Every structure is written in structure tokens, then in C-alpha cells.
């Protein structure tokens, strides 16, 4: 009936910091699991609430116990921990897993007599992190409710990455690819969903030590970025480069071997030096010294090479899946489905007629999926849902409440909805960088027009002007446009898609609209679009239509409403504090058109 899915390990931060040197200030801060801790609630096979702890605790990609998200999810339903029939995790760390780990660490070709240091820390992880006893402890201590062992279901990560996909795909029968990084033991799985049943083809499975995702993570670090937070800069860089031939791609020759049966392996996948083992190889393959490694022309080259291996491998994978099922509807989920550029290639160059990637293709989504995996096994008939607007909402008074605490800092005017829209439109007529706070808090990495900074993409300078006022200049991060679905066909080369409401896909820009929307476009002539309707986001649809009618411009820019390193603003306070620590020209929060003094 009622199921709560969650991700989080209160101690993994300090555990990974201490045992494995992954401190909160390291470039590896985001490169241990439990990142994107969140809670999610199904009631009678309906998703009624979901928020990520990072939106609440204000710590980007948090690994914390999802205390704030759980309470909020239960309060949204006027229910309590006891009422919750079941609790789903989205990590299946079974006793049998640890053994193969303790066992495997024992068979280490590089025993330093410090296989103990290894086995010892993996035990400190197991007894305070991955263990069922450790979960029931952590839950009980943070909730106050004492998690009965009978209520806890630990769901394999991928079966949750997928269960998420399945909740949003709108599909029925379908093939699935899960390519994620951090996982239990498998890095990538494939199979199908036929007559509502999941069957995994074991023959296509890939171990955790041949992680294509990790390879991309190690490229993101090598080039001077964060390995498991900012890979978008490589995808971004890749757009300034011409892809090399797959023969001359040093990553497809010496690192990545395409084995028969849609399989693949990585060199140095057993090297004991860990993931850092590859750093020295890229140096050889790419002629890297300490001076050249973070220079643009070099980065563009590693990024180009890296971008292709993902497209090459995943293609190799799904062309095998194609010959393994007649189903031509795909579910793609896992880290690697954050590569919106590849996602559109898989759709257009491979025999699958529908590739579907959710806002929770990422890990935050295992929290939702955990619950959906449980819900289905229980004959709980799942209500189809397509909305990412799943998190906290704020009322007139709550906003007026917070806007009294900042009267010394900002003036405002509460308006009718039909005119909050109209005024913002005339502002977006000029070069305004505005903040849009509306509806419930979008789930997942990308903002979808409830916590967004809007701006007009027709101003020649606009890319620099947004970067200058939003204080978050990202040299390699392209901006993305919102467009009414009814205009997407005419504005973009949409190929085999009618709509893309989750910016999980990237489309080329028809050269009749390329000047009008150029700030929402990459050097690729590409754009990470968001299709909008009166059904998806009524107020964002109202806004778009009016701004177009005044400007004859079919798209606005939708960029995440945050400061650098900060997660997406969750609350009115969150929004106002961002507004005032930036040079955003106005905030529209609810029915208040806020101005600075």
C-alpha cells in the first residue's frame, strides 16, 4: 500500500574521508556512493512526494541520511514512520556480496601484508555503512522509529535505476540498458521488460572493475575537474572538437576492447593502484605533462576521444540487445544517461525507435525506483506519472513571511497570476536575468522551470551576461532552452522524438531559428531542450507563449537557480539568499515580482 524509498549513509563521508582519503575538499568528494541521498513515497501505486536531502541540507550531492526528505515525504501525506508499510533502499549489499569482497581482496596479486588495511576498512564500511544491521541502526537513530527488519527491502541499484525508468517511460514492454558507475558488483546490465516482468540477460552483464562510467570519471579528474560530479565539461569540450577516427582513438585501442556478444573490458581493470592507475596511461596515450593537461586544445582532444568511447561502447551494447529482442522501445538509466549528447545518437543511429531517459536516470532516482521495484512485486497497480515537480511547494503567506525578513534588502508587489506572467515577459523583453520560483521542487540534477533562472536567448551577449550576473561562469557548460512542445518540431531537428520535457536529450537547431535562440545552443548547433505544455508546467507555458508573442522568440533559457557548488534552491529563503548574493535583476517567487533596493 505505502512504500518509502531512500538513499543515504550518515557515516560513509567520514568513513571514505578517513579510510580512503576522499575528504569533502578532495576532487574525489563525490566519488563514493550514497551521493544524491533522497526520500520518495508511493501510496497505493502513486508517487505522492520526492525530495533530495541536498535541496534541504543545502550540501550538493549529499551522502547524508535523508532525515529532512523523509520527514517532508511523510508530512506531505499526513502519515508517520509506523503507517509506512515498507522501506526500500536501492542498494542490495547482501552478506554474500561482502564475502566475495573479503574473499576477493584476499586474492590480491599485490598483497602488501596490508590486505588487512583493505579487509579492515571494508569491514568498517560494512559495520557502519553497507550492512543490513548498519541500515536499521542508521535509520532508527535518525528517524526515532525503529525499522523492523521485516519492513526493510534492499533493492539492487540497477533494478532501481530501471524501476525509476519504468515509472516515467510511458512504455509497457521494453528493452533496458543500465550503465551506472558505483554499483554493487555489476557496472552495467541489459535485458527486457515483457508483460510487466523484468528479465536480465546475464550474458551482457559487465563487472564493476570494467566501469565505462569510471573511465569517463577518471577523464573528468585527469583534466582538472571532479571525477563523479562534473563530466558535463568533457561532453561540453567534446563539442569544440572533431571526433577522431575510431582506429586512431587511443582509448578504443589500448584502454577499451570491444569483445563479441555486446561485451567489453578495460586495460588496468585489475591494476591494484586503483582508478588512479590510469592517470599515468592517459599521459602516454595523449602526451600529457603537468603543463599541458589542463589546457583547452588538449582537454578538447581527451574529451573528443572520451566522448566517442561512450557512444562507441553503448552502441556496441545496444546493437547486441537489438539482436536479442524484437522490442524497439528502450529504457536507458544509470550515470552514463547523463550524457544527453550520446542519448540522442543512440536514438537516431540505432534500431530502437524510442529511447527514454528520466530526470532520475541519475542516482537520486534509485530512491524513487527502490519504492517502485517494491510496489510492483506487491501487485500494487502503478498509476502512470510523468511529473518531476515532486518536492516542497510554498504558499502566499510563507513567501510574504520570508519577504518581511528581507524588507531592508528588497521591495516587492504581489500580483494576479495572469499579470505575474505578463510582467516577467516584458522584463524578458529587455536583457533581464530573472529567477523563477513556482510549483513543487523539480527532482534530479537539471532544473525544469520551477527553480530556474530565465533569460532571453536572442541577445548576442546573453551567454556572458547570464554568466556575469549568475556568478557561476562555467566556460564549457552550454545553456539550454525551454520551448512549447507545439514549436519544438519547427525550432529543432527533433528526429524520432515528439517531446523532451526532462533535458535528458540534445537536438540540433534548425538554421532558421539559430540566431534567435543562440544563447540556448552549443557550438554544436545543439541544444539540451525542455519541451513545455499547459499540462507539464501551466505557468511556464503561460510565460513562454506571452514572451514569444512580445519578442517573436520561441525559447527562453532555463538555467539552474543556485550559486556555484550550491545545490538547486529549495525554499523561498534559499531563493532570496541566492538573488541577493548574485546580480540577477529580479526574482519572481510565487505571485510576488521581487526587486532589489
Method: X-ray
Residue 161 labelled as part of a binding site: yes
Query: Strand 329-333 and strand 174-179: pairing?
Result: parallel
CA atoms of 58 and 573, how far apart (whole Å): 12
For the range 139-145, what are the long-range contacts, defined as Cβ-Cβ under 8 Å and sequence gap of 24 or more? 139/65, 139/87, 141/10, 142/10, 142/65, 142/67, 143/67, 143/70, 143/81, 144/81, 145/80, 145/81, 145/82
Cα torsion 167, 91, 360, 56: sign: positive
Decide: 446 and 388 in contact? Cβ < 8 Å: no
Q: Which residue has the cell 538555467?
A: 559
CA atoms of 461 and 173, how far apart (whole Å): 47
- Catalytically annotated residues: 35
On the CB side of 313, CA atoms within 13 Å amount to 29
Residue 586 labelled as part of a binding site: no
Q: Residues for the chain: how many in total?
A: 597
Which residues span the domain enclosing 435?
A: 391-596
* 228-249 residues labelled b (16+ CB within 10 A) or e (exposed): bbbbbbbbbbbbbbeeeeeeeb
CA atoms of 154 and 446, how far apart (whole Å): 27
CA atoms of 162 and 166, how far apart (whole Å): 6
User: Which H/E stretch holds residue 559?
Assistant: strand 555-560
User: Any residues with CB less than 8 A from the CB of 577 and at least 6 apart, and which?
Assistant: none
Query: Strand 152-153 and strand 86-88: pairing?
Result: parallel
* Strands across the sheet containing 86-88: 47-52, 38-43, 2-7, 86-88, 152-153
- Residues paired with residue 442 on neighbouring β-strands, in sequence order: 389
Cell of 352: 530502437
Could you count the other beta carbons within 10 Å of the beta carbon of residue 597? 8
DSSP per residue, 186-202: EEEEEEEEETTEEEEEE
CA atoms of 523 and 176, how far apart (whole Å): 31
CA atoms of 545 and 553, how far apart (whole Å): 9
* Strands across the sheet containing 354-356: 197-207, 186-194, 174-179, 329-333, 354-356
DSSP summary character for residue 112: -
Residue 363 labelled as part of a binding site: yes
Which stretches of 224-339 are assigned E, i.e. beta strand?
A: 256-259, 263-266, 329-333
CA atoms of 587 and 401, how far apart (whole Å): 16
Query: Strand 586-589 and strand 433-437: pairing?
Result: parallel
Q: What is the resolution of this structure in A?
A: 3.0
Q: 451: domain CATH number?
A: 3.90.870.20
CA atoms of 515 and 486, how far apart (whole Å): 20
CA-based nearest residue to 317, from 250, 249, 264, 362: 264
Residue 583 labelled as part of a binding site: no
**Three-state secondary structure call for residue 377:** helix
CA atoms of 513 and 487, how far apart (whole Å): 11
- Residues paired with residue 51 on neighbouring β-strands, in sequence order: 39
User: Any residues with CB less than 8 A from the CB of 228 and at least 6 apart, and which?
Assistant: 28, 30, 31, 35, 181, 182, 217, 220, 335
Decide: 369 and 155 in contact? Cβ < 8 Å: yes
CA atoms of 144 and 149, how far apart (whole Å): 15
User: Any residues with CB less than 8 A from the CB of 148 and at least 6 apart, and which?
Assistant: none
Q: CA-CA distances (angstroms) from residue 119 to 64, 433, 473?
A: 24, 53, 43
Amino acid at each position: 500500500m505505502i512504500i518509502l524509498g531512500y538513499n543515504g549513509f550518515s557515516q560513509i563521508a567520514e568513513l571514505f574521508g578517513r579510510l580512503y582519503g576522499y575528504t569533502a575538499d578532495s576532487v574525489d568528494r563525490h566519488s563514493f556512493l550514497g551521493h544524491d541521498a533522497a526520500a520518495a513515497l508511493f501510496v497505493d501505486g502513486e508517487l505522492v512526494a520526492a525530495v533530495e536531502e541536498e535541496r534541504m541540507n543545502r550540501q550538493k550531492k549529499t551522502t547524508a541520511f535523508p532525515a529532512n526528505a523523509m520527514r517532508w515525504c511523510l508530512e506531505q501525506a499526513g502519515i508517520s514512520y509506523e503507517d509506512v508499510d515498507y522501506y526500500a533502499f536501492g542498494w542490495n549489499f547482501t552478506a554474500e556480496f561482502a564475502d566475495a569482497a573479503i574473499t576477493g581482496l584476499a586474492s590480491a596479486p599485490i598483497p602488501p601484508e596490508y590486505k588487512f588495511q583493505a579487509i579492515g576498512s571494508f569491514g568498517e564500511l560494512w559495520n557502519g555503512a553497507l550492512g543490513r544491521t548498519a541500515l536499521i541502526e542508521d535509520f532508527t537513530r535518525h528517524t526515532g522509529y525503529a525499522l523492523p527488519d521485516e519492513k526493510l527491502i534492499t533493492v539492487p541499484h540497477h533494478r532501481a535505476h530501471l524501476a525509476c525508468g519504468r515509472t516515467f517511460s510511458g512504455l509497457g514492454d521494453a528493452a533496458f540498458l543500465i550503465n551506472d558507475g558505483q554499483a554493487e558488483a555489476d557496472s552495467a546490465i541489459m535485458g527486457e521488460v515483457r508483460d510487466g516482468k523484468v528479465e536480465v540477460f546475464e550474458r551482457f552483464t559487465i563487472d564493476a572493475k570494467n566501469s565505462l562510467a569510471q573511465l569517463f570519471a577518471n577523464i573528468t579528474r585527469y583534466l582538472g575537474f571532479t571525477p563523479n560530479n562534473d563530466e558535463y565539461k568533457v561532453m561540453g569540450l567534446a563539442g569544440f572538437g572533431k571526433a577522431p577516427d575510431e582506429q586512431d582513438n587511443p582509448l578504443l585501442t589500448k584502454v577499451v576492447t570491444l569483445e563479441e556478444g555486446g561485451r567489453y573490458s578495460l586495460a588496468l581493470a585489475n591494476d591494484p593502484r586503483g582508478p588512479r592507475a590510469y592517470d599515468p596511461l592517459f599521459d602516454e596515450l595523449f602526451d600529457g605533462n603537468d603543463d599541458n593537461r589542463q589546457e583547452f586544445d588538449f582537454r578538447v582532444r581527451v574529451a573528443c576521444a572520451a566522448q566517442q568511447v561512450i557512444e562507441a561502447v553503448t552502441a556496441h551494447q545496444l546493437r547486441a540487445l537489438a539482436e536479442a529482442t524484437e522490442l524497439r522501445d528502450l529504457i536507458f538509466e544509470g550515470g552514463l544517461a547523463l550524457n544527453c549528447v550520446n542519448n540522442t545518437k543512440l536514438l537516431e543511429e540505432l534500431p530502437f525507435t524510442r529511447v527514454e531517459v528520466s530526470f532520475g536516470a541519475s542516482d537520486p532516482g534509485v530512491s524513487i525506483g527502490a519504492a517502485a521495484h517494491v510496489a510492483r512485486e506487491k501487485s500494487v497497480a502503478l498509476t502512470p506519472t510523468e511529473s518531476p515537480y515532486l518536492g516542497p511547494e510554498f504558499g502566499e503567506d510563507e513567501i510574504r513571511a520570508t519577504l518581511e525578513e528581507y524588507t531592508s534588502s528588497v521591495t516587492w508587489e504581489q500580483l494576479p497570476s495572469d499579470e505575474v506572467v505578463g510582467k516577467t515577459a516584458e522584463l524578458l523583453t529587455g536583457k533581464t536575468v530573472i529567477g523563477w520560483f513556482q510549483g513543487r521542487t523539480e527532482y534530479g540534477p537539471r532544473a525544469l522551470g520551477n527553480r530556474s533562472i530565465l533569460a532571453n536567448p536572442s541577445y548576442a551577449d546573453m551567454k556572458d551576461v547570464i554568466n556575469n550576473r549568475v556568478k557561476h561562469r562555467e566556460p564549457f557548460r552550454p545553456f539550454a532552452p525551454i520551448v512549447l512542445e507545439e514549436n519544438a518540431a519547427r525550432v529543432f531537428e527533433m528526429g524520432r522524438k515528439e517531446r523532451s520535457p526532462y533535458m535528458t536529450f540534445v537536438f540540433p537547431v534548425r538554421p532558421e531559428y539559430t540566431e534567435k535562440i543562440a544563447a540556448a545552443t552549443h557550438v554544436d548547433a545543439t541544444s539540451r531542450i525542455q519541451t513545455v505544455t499547459e499540462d507539464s508546467n501551466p505557468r511556464l507555458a503561460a510565460l513562454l507563449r506571452e514572451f514569444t508573442s512580445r519578442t517573436d522568440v520561441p525559447c527562453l533559457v532555463n538555467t539552474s537557480f543556485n550559486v556555484a557548488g550550491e545545490p538547486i534552491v529549495c525554499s523561498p529563503k534559499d531563493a532570496v539568499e541566492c538573488f541577493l548574493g548574485t546580480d540577477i535583476d529580479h526574482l519572481v517567487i510565487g505571485d510576488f515580482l521581487v526587486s532589489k533596493r
